[PDB]
Design a protein around this ligand. Sequence first.
Ligand SMILES: *C(=O)CCCCCCCCCCCCC
Ligand SMILES: [Cl-]
Ligand SMILES: [Cl-]
Ligand SMILES: [Mg+2]
Ligand code: NA
Lengths: 270, 98, 5
Amino acid sequence: GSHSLRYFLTGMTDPGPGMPRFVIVGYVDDKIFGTYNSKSRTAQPIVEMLPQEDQEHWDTQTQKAQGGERDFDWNLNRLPERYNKSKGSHTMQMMFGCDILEDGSIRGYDQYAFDGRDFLAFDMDTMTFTAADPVAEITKRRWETEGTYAERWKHELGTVCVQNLRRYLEHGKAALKRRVQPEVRVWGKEADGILTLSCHAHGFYPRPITISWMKDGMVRDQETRWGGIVPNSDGTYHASAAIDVLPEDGDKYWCRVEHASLPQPGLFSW
Amino acid sequence: DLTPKVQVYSRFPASAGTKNVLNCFAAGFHPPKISITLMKDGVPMEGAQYSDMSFNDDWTFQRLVHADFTPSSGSTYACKVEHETLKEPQVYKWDPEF
Amino acid sequence: GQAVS
Ligand SMILES: *C(=O)CCCCCCCCCCCCC
Ligand SMILES: [Cl-]
Ligand SMILES: [Cl-]
Ligand SMILES: [Mg+2]
Ligand code: NA
């Protein structure tokens, strides 16, 4: 019965035409609750999840996100030269947040990447840093010697994140609890004398799902390919599995789909 | 290996002449700059929208592009992806499954 | 966080 809050921060030297150079996406469990970007310069809730938000709270989120924008711009102007890299474009990333476990205990997370590679991590429980390489080590030693970062982020992860997680869970409880059954389609195309049975589960929420193929009532994983779980724009998800089958055996296979919206797992055929 | 991994799929199970949403999801790539273009018979679809740039636990980037459309049995739909790791644009054809 | 040096 645990819950999670995560922030995904990206700064970019070359985001693409018309693209913000700095973006924040925030998630509560597997649901986007709000975003920030350097073009609008405003942090805004996803009103479908959070329909009655007070401006005070998002004034606060905006300010804090704008500070993150300045720091990422600061880093992107200094780190490429410190790494002696000739790369054209550069990226800076950070993911941080907290978990509240079922028994009420707390976990904090705080990790950075530069050009898509581990850079620095902070462990709130020990209040210690980990550098990914000797260049990041210089930052680690500076941060820990000044002492201020550990205190700020122990408070941020262990107190502020937890408070906001509880707020978002309450404010967005209708959205978070509303289950959406998948619509399952099973298809078959016959190429080169073999039949590909594909199973597609459309538009489910929440995110966890399993899809298995069976023959004569016995699961068959060795010949199965899974497409993975991918997003729809409305907060639901999509997932798929395929298996290759002799066309003469096409009626003997069953797709098994298990989802929290289904009291019992669903069995589907071609 | 940091090339985009691309899936094309409709929001709802597809049925000719019934309104739907076409999705093109690219993931696993770096750097984040990417062109993703939904197309009907080689013509960009109108009203397409893209997700705010985000990334996976392994730091690789991800982007979903979607557009409302009404699948025609007479038409070919596809997603054109253009990225620094690719020397030429990659066109991913939607399998309609109907 | 600024990655000072
Ligand atoms: C240096 O490490 C920069 C730290 C940046 C922290 C910014 C956190 C912003 C939180 C609110 C985001 C609201 C939008 C989802
Ligand atoms: Cl059908
Ligand atoms: Cl049937
Ligand atoms: Mg149309
Ligand atoms: Na079906």
